[PDB]
Symmetry: C2
Subunit: 98 residues, 2 copies
Amino acid sequence: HHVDDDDKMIEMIATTMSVPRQVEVTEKFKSLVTAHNGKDEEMKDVAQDMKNYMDEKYGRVWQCVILTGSYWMHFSHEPFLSIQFRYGRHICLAWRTP
Amino acid sequence: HHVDDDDKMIEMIATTMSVPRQVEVTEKFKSLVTAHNGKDEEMKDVAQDMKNYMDEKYGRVWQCVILTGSYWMHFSHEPFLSIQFRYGRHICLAWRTP
């Protein structure tokens, strides 16, 4: 019912990934953001480590965008692996391109 | 000095594109957003037409993200064509991947 910035939850927005990958990707984001104390000038580094973790673990090439606010996007009409989720104030968009 | 939502200006954030392409890409964004009256539920379509215009005019594959708010991103340490700019409340991120 009621959290704060310590025990806040991951909220899925949209994904085409398998359940087990959704869990890995979101737990990784959780630990990366927490390590850096959630600082905003640290988010470029979080975006970088997300992209590297996923390149290594699911093959290349991933894009990662972190934001606060609203967004509208387009990459492909084709199927591709993507995930969009919220962790507190940050929204992570990650997806893979051929 | 002073504008409104009709004669608002394009504000460059970051780019690796040539001057003449910056001009083409930003004028295109201007006309696409203006046609759709700047509506927010229209922005997915604007993101789509941006991506298609650039695929056709500069070769594939482009990604386009439109947002309001703050953002931190990562695709590559390598050189790639990208552009980030603001038009009023909307921020356009567009870049090309091999």
